[PDB]
Amino acid sequence: GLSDGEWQQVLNVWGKVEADIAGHGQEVLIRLFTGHPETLEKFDKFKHLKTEAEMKASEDLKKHGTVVLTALGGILKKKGHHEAELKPLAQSHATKHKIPIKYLEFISDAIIHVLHSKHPGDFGADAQGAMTKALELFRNDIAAKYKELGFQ
């Protein structure tokens, strides 16, 4: 798992996200969609977004970004003790939304990129290591539930 020190880093980094949850959420989703257009096809409500300008202009996309990062923040603040929080998400993403685990790798990478982009020189090597571990833990625990369901 993560050490106490590592969790403290993760939640310190998370402070940056919480100052502007919508802005971070928006940029994370745009990074995902532009980098991996197939991901956009999983969202009936974002399929109409034909350009980054349109994405940037979408208030509903920002709204969804807030929902997303709020959920992730809840999970992170449990410091690995997140079974109750993670289970329903694993299940809706496998069974309803059909999100391959690869897309969760994509969005994890997007979060790391966005943190650097918004906080250049202020997301240090130790912070990136800790945040990376936390996101891998999240991914890995979801993947365990995906395996249970035989999804993908």
| Binding residue positions for O2 | 64
> Residues within the annotated binding site for nitrite?
64
| Least distance to ligand O=N[O-], CB of residue 29, Å | 6
**Residue 67 engages ligand MNR in binding (rule: CB under 6 A):** yes
Long-range Cβ pairs for the range 121-127 (8 Å, 24+): 122/16, 123/13, 123/16, 126/9, 127/9, 127/12, 127/13
Answer for the pair 151, 96: CB distance below 8 angstroms, yes or no. Answer: no
29 binds, among ligand MNR, ligand O=N[O-], none (CB under 5 to 8 A by kind): ligand O=N[O-]
> Residues within the annotated binding site for heme b?
93
9 binds, among ligand MNR, ligand O=N[O-], none (CB under 5 to 8 A by kind): none
Answer for the pair 123, 13: CB distance below 8 angstroms, yes or no. Answer: yes
Q: 80: which residues sit within 8 A by CB, 6+ positions away?
A: 1, 2, 7, 137
| Least distance to ligand O=N[O-], CB of residue 64, Å | 6
Looking at 3, 8, 12, 92, which residue binds ligand MNR (CB under 6 A)? 92
The 10 Å CB-count burial string (b at 16+, else e) for 68-94 is bbeebeebbeebbebeebbeebbbebb
**Residue 43 engages ligand MNR in binding (rule: CB under 6 A):** yes
Looking at 10, 13, 17, 29, which residue binds ligand O=N[O-] (CB under 6 A)? 29
72 binds, among ligand O=N[O-], ligand MNR, none (CB under 5 to 8 A by kind): ligand MNR
**Residue 75 engages ligand O=N[O-] in binding (rule: CB under 6 A):** no
